[PDB]
Amino acid sequence: TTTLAFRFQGGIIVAVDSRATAGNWVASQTVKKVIEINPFLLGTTAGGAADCQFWETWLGSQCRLHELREKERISVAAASKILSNLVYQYKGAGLSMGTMICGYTRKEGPTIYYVDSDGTRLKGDIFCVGSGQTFAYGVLDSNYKWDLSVEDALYLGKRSILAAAHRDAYSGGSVNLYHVTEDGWIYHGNHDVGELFWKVKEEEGSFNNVIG
Amino acid sequence: TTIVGVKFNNGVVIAADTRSTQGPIVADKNCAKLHRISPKIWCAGAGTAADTEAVTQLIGSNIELHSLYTSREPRVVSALQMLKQHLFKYQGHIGAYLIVAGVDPTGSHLFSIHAHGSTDVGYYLSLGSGSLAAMAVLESHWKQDLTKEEAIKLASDAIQAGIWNDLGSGSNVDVCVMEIGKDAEYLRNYLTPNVREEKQKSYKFPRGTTAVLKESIVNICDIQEE
């Protein structure tokens, strides 16, 4: 698995791979690792697939009950803390979760919270989680700027998953892109890594080691 | 694996299935489990496949040299003694479980050998994962003074019980008949009750379907003259 999310001028980019494995066996290449909590909030899935799916879907239900009661959009801080407090109750039971709760509100602006099955809750600008996280971090750290355009930021997130998908054996399949704005998230398509790799290799001149 | 041995009037017969497995995966669908120690001494093996093949070739090799040295045709008791002493020395680490059968100047013989070096005598025997299914058939239909034709029928029926009821056994039935005063007749694929049905579709691809990056001629020939 490789999942990332970073804050920038235009909001948040979320990018994930699509591979699911049971040991060496590739169970699926078409897995959705972005949970659409609601039209404004996104969550990434790493670690336990069921744990992330179930509890982030549940989180969406809690966020809906909040804004019904309070007549106001839930903050990313409050939403993330509902999830972290929940998994903290289960601490020791064996939940496996590594996620970024991403959102864009008026009072906060674009916000990302890394939430953990150990109970960790961290606000930050750039996060990468999964077996191929180190590969994605390299491309991000060297190319990241706050004043990136929405077009370039989307490509950076795409290219960073591709970097991991190439090197990490347990990452690949396809890349899912999302752009989170104040008015809600916007889906930016599914991109097959097989086709994307050759496209990027030629146009960018990268991956000279690989014969194409 | 299902292997059996059955004594009869003027000799002995051994039989085996033809399935070799890697856990739950079938590696070879027509494996040859009937091995030759000498022209008229054959054996069938179960357990670790490399050990059964290796131990029969080694003893079979030493049996041949012994036969040449003594100017006598090899005896089953010699194969038995050499096999058991070898297997005992390695304390079961050589995972060979064998049914040894054959004819020699002394007469017709049938023995089983276990990996730790213990041996048994019998008129009918079975070994392998399908040995219980096979032994059920043998215990139901075996009698004294079987004919050659009855023993082949019984042996192959015992293998069939393993083929159908044991997941570790399948495919075909191999048989070898060793009669006194005769050449041993190896009957490869004596029964073939598991032919695959014709597929619903042909999966022959159109030429040029596979994407290719480079082509080249490989030089298998030696360095050339001139």
């Binding site: 069921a50 799916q53 179930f54 | 570790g168 495919s171 695959r196 619903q200 579709k201 379907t209 994407a211």
Partner: protein, 222 residues
Amino acid sequence: QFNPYGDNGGTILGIAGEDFAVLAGDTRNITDYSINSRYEPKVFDCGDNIVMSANGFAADGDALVKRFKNSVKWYHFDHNDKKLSINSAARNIQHLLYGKRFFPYYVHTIIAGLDEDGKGAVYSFDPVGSYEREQCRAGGAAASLIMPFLDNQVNFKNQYEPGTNGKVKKPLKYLSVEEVIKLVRDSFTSATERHIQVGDGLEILIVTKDGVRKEFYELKRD
């Protein structure tokens, strides 16, 4: 020590067509190297035009199917005989599975049917309730033998159009119910040859707007 789990073998296969869906499974039931039954139905009609199979440990498989069938019945009572849509059934099964997160149903569940637009649908679940709509999914013992074949023959993976040499992919043309059944039968015939736990019989349930139909085929019994 008491081990509450077991492996009953078996292999299942769900394929979603354009306006239909099939869920197939072999009828062999096993423990270790023994055959329990040559015909023990594994794929079930659960009502509301939904078919289901929970492959792996048969006791948990039977328990889950039984509980889901029960959920369909009570959905009708509580919601004015409303039809349970395949997507709603899928979410319900997630909660049944995740309900035993810390003592799981040791099964790989697949359901098939039609979505609310009438298109073919298959959903695939892990033992603890993570799920996803899929076009093609084999489950169980010989799943690793079947899926690569389906990638190649259903989705036309690694297949390109002759003459172009890797530049143009083979187009993803729609398969008929007759065409799918051929691939299902050949998948199980091949799996039977190379996997010891697969054999005896193949039972296929076909779901269309007209209802649920069954087809049975013999497999090698060795």
